[PDB]
Every structure is written in structure tokens, then in C-alpha cells.
Amino acid sequence: KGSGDYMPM
Amino acid sequence: SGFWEEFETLQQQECKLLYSRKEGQRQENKNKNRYKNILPFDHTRVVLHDGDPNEPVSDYINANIIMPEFGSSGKKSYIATQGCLQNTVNDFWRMVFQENSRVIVMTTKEVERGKSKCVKYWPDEYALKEYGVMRVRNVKESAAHDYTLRELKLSKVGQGNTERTVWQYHFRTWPDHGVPSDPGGVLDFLEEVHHKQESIMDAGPVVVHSSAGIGRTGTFIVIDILIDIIREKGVDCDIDVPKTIQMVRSQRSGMVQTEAQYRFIYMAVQHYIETLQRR
């Protein structure tokens, strides 16, 4: 959360 | 778990240095990516030609060509891409036009859980819109249970006889979390997509998108590839899900993101096989 990364999660 | 270890083996194979992604890392391209960590491989990216000569970098979209086999024609290939950003709608239609794509598969809503997964890139029904140099008309929408089909007409402003129909298959009921609990809706959808694509002479690759262009995108593409193998070679053909995922991951990183998507792929193949038996 908040990293700016895609997490399909 | 057979699935867990198969999927974990694949995930380990991507915990390493992969092919170059330098174009997506250029400063001029940073706001063209929805996610900083999801970038196209340089060698299979869709290179956009014919851009505004005033724009220093006009050849980039976060998208890759995906061939199911090494010598695949364009018609049997895919483009895996992210949902449009507000500032990449025009580049998306440049891509569709240039690659002669006639079918788009959208695997998200525009917004899910308050987050934009794709900015709207089609006109309202019956309306005409200009997207940069491209003109699009939404001719007609047809609603089905799990998806909406939009018949779009795309042309290049200031070049006449460039018009072509682009069929947007918009899957609308994928769950906000996880995967559908059975694959019937997805299989019925892909059957319509496949018949539409097959019917168009010299169609370019089918465009498939999700918020990042890899999770749901990879799941739809790998299912479509596997059921076409069965379509051609019949229900007792060899099916190799890990090898097919590896083939597509050599062309865009991270295709198929979760163990639930991996299980869903197997489920869809089994249901399609079963269908070829009942009818």
C-alpha cells in the first residue's frame, strides 16, 4: 500500500 | 499442491535479471506507466511510429506483442497492455490503428474499489469523438450477462478510406478480488472474441488490457491460447500450462499474477474440454 507498485492483491 | 508448486516454480524463474526495459524507464515515459514496476520489454514493445514531430519522445506505449508460437501471424497474436491513463488514450488509439487491431478485450471496469483501472477511451453509444488524429464512432452497444460488446469505427482524420471496425469486448463482472468461481462466463466470452477475430480478413493482433496489463491480461491470453490448441488439435492434445505461461512471460514480464489465476486457467481448460464432449 502506497509504494506505487502493482500488487494484484 | 500441484498448482502451488507449479506456480511457485514459475515465480522463482522471474526472481532474476530479465530482459531490458529501458525505454519504459526513460524520464519522458514515466507518466505513461500506471505502475513504476510494470514496464514492457524493449525487444517486444509496441513502437509507435508517425508521432507528432514536436514531441521529443512519441514512440512509447506500455504494451508488448505476445505471440503464442514463434512464427505466429499477427492475426493469431495479442497485444498485452495496461488500461489507458488520461494522457495515453491518444497513444492507445495510435497503437490500435497502426497494428491493424480489430478486437479489444477489456478485463476491468473503468474503476474498481475507488481506483482507476482504465480511463474511458470510447465514445458514448452513437457518439463520435476525436482522440488526437484518430476519430472513433461508437456505432452500437450489445449487452450480455457478463460483458458488453461495442462496435466502434476507427479512422484517421485527414486520410480517407482508413476506416475499420474495431470490436470492443468489455468483460464487466470480474470480481474486485480474486477470480470468478467458475470459468463459464469467461469461456463464452472468449468464444465470441475468437469467432469475431477469425471472421475478419487480415486482422492484426487482439488487444487485451487490465490495470497493469499482466494479471487478468495474462489469464485471458493464456486461456485463449490453450483453448485454441484444443480447438485445432482436439481434446486429447498435450496441454502444458507452465510452458505456455513461460512463452508469454518471455514477451511481457509477470503475465498471470496469482495462484488463483493459475488455478482458474486449469479450470477453464478442463471446462472447455468437457464442453467439447457434451456438445
In short, what is this structure?
Chain B: This is Tyrosine-protein phosphatase non-receptor type 11. The complex is a heterodimer of chains A (9) and B (279). Chain A is low in regular secondary structure and 9 residues long.
Structure description:
The complex is a heterodimer of chains A (9) and B (279). Chain A has 9 residues and is largely without helices or strands. Chain A has no helices and no strands. By secondary structure, chain B is of the alpha/beta class. Chain B is built from 7 helices and 10 strands. The longest helix of chain B is centred in the C-terminal third of the chain and has 20 residues. Chain A: This is Insulin receptor substrate 1. Chain A: It comes from Homo sapiens (Human).
Class by alpha and beta content of chain B: alpha/beta
Bulk shape of chain B: globular
| Major beta sheet summary of chain B | 8 strands, mixed
Radius of gyration of chain A: 6 Å
Residue share in helix of chain B:
25-40%
The number of E-state strands of chain A comes to: 0
Reading side by side through the largest sheet of chain B, how are the strands ordered? 1-2-10-3-9-8-7-6
Sequence of secondary-structure elements of chain B? HHEEHEEEEEEEHEHHH
Beginning-to-end CA distance, first to last residue of chain A: 10 Å
The helix content of chain A, as a percent range, equals under 10%
Largest interface: A-B, 5 and 13 residues
CATH topology assignment of chain B: Protein-Tyrosine Phosphatase, Chain A
Protein name (chain B): Tyrosine-protein phosphatase non-receptor type 11
Family (chain B): Belongs to the protein-tyrosine phosphatase family. Non-receptor class 2 subfamily.
Domain Tyrosine-protein phosphatase (chain B): 3-268
Binding site for substrate (chain B): 176, 210-216, 257
